[PDB]
Design a protein around this ligand. Structure first.
Ligand SMILES: [Ca+2]
Ligand SMILES: [Ca+2]
Length: 686
C-alpha cells in the first residue's frame, strides 16, 4: 500500500496527529458519564470527569470536524480501566479523567466507552483514514498508600477482572516499595514511586508478562501507535524488551515522553530516542518553537540551530513527534498573545520534519496554564477559525508532498525575525517563509530555492499574509517584502526517479519481522533491499511499490545495519542507518554484581557476546550500572534486554574515562529465560 496509507502503522511522518484528552473533547454518550463526586458536566472543575468519550470522537470524525482539518491521526487518553476513586488531594477532589491511573490494562475505562466502543472508534477512524494512537502508561497503576490500604484503590492491579494484587501487602512484589522519587537521579526516578503512584515492578515476571500481553491485546484491537508514558521512569532495559515485544509481534509507531525544560539538553534523552526502539516527543523542538514564536526568548538563529542540530542528534529525526504545546505545558496561546503567533507556530510545526501533533483545541485558541488548566473542554467546534484553516491547508501536504513528510531542512534566508527554509526530498520541495515580527515587513533579497521556475502560489492562500513566489532560472526568487507576521508555503512535487528512503519502521526487530521502508522512487518492480551487504530479494520482499517496501529482516547476526534500497534497475537509495537487528526475542534480566568497588568517576558496566550486550566492546558496554535504590554500592544492578532462551557469555568491567578494567577469570555464562525475567546475582571476579 502507499506510504501515506492509513494502514501504515509503522511510520507517521506523513500524518498530522491531533492529541485528544478524551474526557475534554466531546461527550457523545451521556449514559456512560461518571456520577456523583467524580463528574462535573459543566467541566469547571478540571480534575473531575466532564464526560467526553470515544463516541464523541467518532462523532467528530463523522461530521467532518477532524477530517475537515486534515488530521490523519488522533492520539487519545490511555484506554484502559482506571480506578474509580475520587481522591481528595488537600481539598481538591481528583479523578482518573486523564486515563493515567490504571487498574486493569485489559479492560476499557467505561467513562470512555466499552470494548465495542473502542472497536467502533478504531473502525470509524480507519474508514476516514485516521490512525489511532493510544497512551499506555506501564510504569504505575494508581494513587496508593501501603500504610493506608483504604486510600484510593490501594494501587490494585487486576488482569481482566482478576485481582493480581494491591500495594499494601505485596508479598509477590508486583510493586516497588522504596519510597517516592525526589527526581535527583535517573535511577531514583526509575525505582522509587512517581509522586504516590504505585510503581510497577517490571522485574517481577508476572508484571512483565502481563504488560506485554496487555499491549498485544491493544495491538490486536487495531491501534496504530502507542505513546508510552513516563519513559524516564522505567528501566531502559525493560522498555527495550517491551519495544521488542511490539515490533516482533505487530510493530506500530511508538514514542514516549522524556521531559526536557527550556534549553536543557540531555544526552540520555537522545540515547533513548536513538536506542530504545521508540521515538520521543520532540521537546527540544517544542521548547525552541515556544521560545522563538511565543515567548521571544530566542530568535530565528536559535530556531535554525535547533533544526540543524536535531537533524544530526536524532538518528531518525523523521520519527520525533513535534508540537508547540501538549498536556504537559501551558497552552501556547496566552490571553494577551497575538493569535498570529499561534498560527505561525502551527504552520511551522506542520511543515517541519517529524510527526506533527496538534493539541486539541489549538485551532480554537484555547489558553490556559499548566495542569489542569491546559486540559479544559474545548469550547467550540467552529471550522472557520484561521487556525483551523491553517491546519486544513497545510496538514494534507504531509501526505501529498514527500519533501514535508521526509525531507531535509535547509535554511535559505534568515535574520533575527525571519526564517525561510526549504524541505527537500528528491525533487520535491517545500519552502516556508515566516516573519515573526508582527510590526516590520522583511525585505527578502537574494533568496535561492530548489524550486523550478514558476509563479508559486502560497498554499496558505494569503491567510497568513503570504505572497506568490516568482522563481526564475536557477531557483532564484524575485525579491519580495514579507508582510509583518507573514507566513507563506510554496511547493513543487514530482516523481523521484531514484530510490530515496524517507523513513523505516520499526527500527529494531528480530530476523523474520517485516519492516516498512517508505520513500519515493522505488518503482513498481521489485528490486533489492540491503541490510549491510546482505541482499534481500524475491519472496522475502513482502511488498514493493514506489513509495513503500515491506521486507522481512534477513537472518543476519544481531547488530546495527544500514539499509539501502536498489530499484529494479540497480539504482541505489541513500543509506538509512542505525537499524538494529535483534538476536531474537528479548527478556529483561536484572544483573547484580557485588563487591565492585570503584574509584571516583569509575562505574561498572556489562558486556557480553551478543549485540544486545555490545558484542564484547567496552565502548558499547551496558551501563553505567546502578547502585543506590534496589541494591547499594558496592553492589551494582541493571535491567538489560537480552535474547531470550539462550546462553550468553558476559563479563563486567569498570570504566573510568578511557580505562577499562575487566573482571578476571573465565567469562560468565547464563542461560536466559524464554519469557519473563531473571536475576543474575554474582560477585566481582578479580
Ligand atoms: Ca460520556
Ligand atoms: Ca518506575
Amino acid at each position: 500500500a502507499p506510504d501515506t496509507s492509513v494502514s501504515n502503522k509503522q511510520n507517521f511522518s506523513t500524518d498530522v496527529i491531533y492529541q485528544i484528552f478524551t474526557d475534554r473533547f466531546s461527550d457523545g454518550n451521556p449514559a456512560n458519564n461518571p456520577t456523583g463526586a467524580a463528574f462535573d458536566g459543566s467541566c469547571t472543575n478540571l480534575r473531575l470527569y466532564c464526560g467526553g468519550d470515544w463516541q464523541g470522537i467518532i462523532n467528530k470524525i463523522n461530521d467532518g470536524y477532524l477530517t475537515g482539518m486534515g488530521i490523519t491521526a488522533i492520539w487519545i487518553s490511555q484506554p484502559v480501566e482506571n480506578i474509580y476513586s475520587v481522591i481528595n488531594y488537600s481539598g481538591v477532589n481528583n479523578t482518573a479523567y486523564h486515563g493515567y491511573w490504571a487498574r486493569d490494562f485489559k479492560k476499557t475505562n467505561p467513562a470512555y466507552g466499552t470494548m465495542q466502543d473502542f472497536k467502533n472508534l478504531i473502525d470509524t477512524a480507519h474508514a476516514h483514514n485516521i490512525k489511532v494512537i493510544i497512551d499506555f502508561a506501564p510504569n504505575h497503576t494508581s494513587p496508593a498508600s501501603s500504610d493506608d490500604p483504604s486510600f484510593a484503590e490501594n494501587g490494585r492491579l487486576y488482569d481482566n477482572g482478576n485481582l493480581l494484587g494491591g500495594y499494601t501487602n505485596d508479598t509477590q512484589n508486583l510493586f516497588h516499595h522504596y519510597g517516592g522519587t525526589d527526581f535527583s537521579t535517573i535511577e531514583n526516578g526509575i525505582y522509587k514511586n512517581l509522586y504516590d503512584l504505585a510503581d510497577l515492578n517490571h522485574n517481577n515476571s508476572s508484571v512483565d508478562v502481563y504488560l506485554k500481553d496487555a499491549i498485544k491485546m491493544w495491538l490486536d484491537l487495531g491501534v496504530d501507535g502507542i505513546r508510552v508514558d513516563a519513559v524516564k521512569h522505567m528501566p531502559f532495559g525493560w522498555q527495550k524488551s517491551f519495544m521488542a515485544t511490539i515490533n516482533n509481534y505487530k510493530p506500530v509507531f511508538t514514542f514516549g515522553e522524556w521531559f526536557l525544560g527550556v534549553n536543557e539538553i540531555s544526552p540520555e534523552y537522545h540515547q533513548f530516542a536513538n536506542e530504545s526502539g521508540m521515538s520521543l516527543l520532540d521537546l527540544r523542538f517544542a521548547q525552541k518553537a515556544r521560545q522563538v514564536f511565543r515567548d521571544n526568548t530566542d530568535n530565528m538563529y536559535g530556531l535554525k540551530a535547533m533544526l540543524e542540530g536535531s537533524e544530526v542528534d536524532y538518528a531518525q529525526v523523521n520519527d520525533q513527534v513535534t508540537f508547540i504545546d501538549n498536556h504537559d505545558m501551558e497552552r501556547f496561546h496566552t490571553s494577551n498573545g497575538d493569535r498570529r503567533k499561534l498560527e505561525q507556530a502551527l504552520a511551522f510545526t506542520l511543515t517541519s520534519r517529524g510527526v506533527p501533533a496538534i493539541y486539541y483545541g489549538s485551532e480554537q485558541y484555547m489558553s490556559g496554564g499548566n495542569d489542569p488548566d491546559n486540559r479544559a473542554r474545548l469550547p467550540s467546534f467552529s471550522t472557520t477559525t484561521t487556525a483551523y484553516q491553517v491546519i486544513q491547508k497545510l496538514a494534507p501536504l504531509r501526505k501529498s508532498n514527500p519533501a514535508i513528510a521526509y525531507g531535509s531542512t535547509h535554511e535559505r534566508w534568515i535574520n533575527n525575525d525571519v526564517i525561510i527554509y526549504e524541505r527537500k526530498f528528491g525533487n520535491n520541495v517545500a519552502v516556508v517563509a515566516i516573519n515573526r515580527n508582527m510590526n516590520t515587513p522583511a525585505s527578502i533579497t537574494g533568496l535561492v530555492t530548489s524550486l523550478p521556475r514558476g509563479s508559486y502560489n502560497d498554499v496558505l492562500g494569503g491567510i497568513l499574509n503570504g505572497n506568490t513566489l516568482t522563481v526564475g532560472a536557477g531557483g532564484a526568487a524575485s525579491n519580495f517584502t514579507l508582510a509583518p507576521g507573514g507566513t507563506a508555503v510554496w511547493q513543487y512535487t514530482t516523481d523521484a526517479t531514484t530510490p530515496i528512503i524517507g523513513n523505516v519502521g520499526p527500527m529494531m526487530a528480530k530476523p523474520g519481522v517485516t519492516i516498512t521502508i517508505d520513500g519515493r522512487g522505488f518503482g513498481s518492480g521489485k528490486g533489492t533491499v540491503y541490510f549491510g551487504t546482505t541482499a534481500v530479494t524475491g519472496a522475502d520482499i513482502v511488498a514493493w511499490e514506489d513509495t513503500q517496501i515491506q521486507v522481512k529482516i534477513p537472518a543476519v547476526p544481531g547488530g546495527i545495519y544500514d539499509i539501502r534500497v536498489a530499484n529494479a534497475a540497480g539504482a541505489a537509495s541513500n543509506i538509512y542507518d542505525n537499524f538494529e537487528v535483534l538476536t531474537g526475542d528479548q527478556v529483561t534480566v536484572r544483573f547484580v554484581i557485588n563487591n565492585a568497588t570503584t574509584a571516583l568517576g569509575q562505574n561498572v558496566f556489562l558486556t557480553g557476546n551478543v549485540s544486545e550486550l555490545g558484542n564484547w566492546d567496552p565502548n558499547n558496554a551496558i551501563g553505567p550500572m546502578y547502585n543506590q535504590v534496589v541494591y547499594q554500592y558496592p553492589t551494582w544492578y541493571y535491567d538489560v534486554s537480552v535474547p531470550a532462551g539462550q546462553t550468553i557469555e558476559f563479563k563486567f568491567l569498570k570504566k573510568q574515562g578511557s580505562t577499562v578494567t575487566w573482571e578476571g577469570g573465565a567469562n560468565r555464562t547464563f542461560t536466559t529465560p524464554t519469557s519473563g525475567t531473571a536475576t543474575v546475582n554474582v560477585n566481582w571476579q578479580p
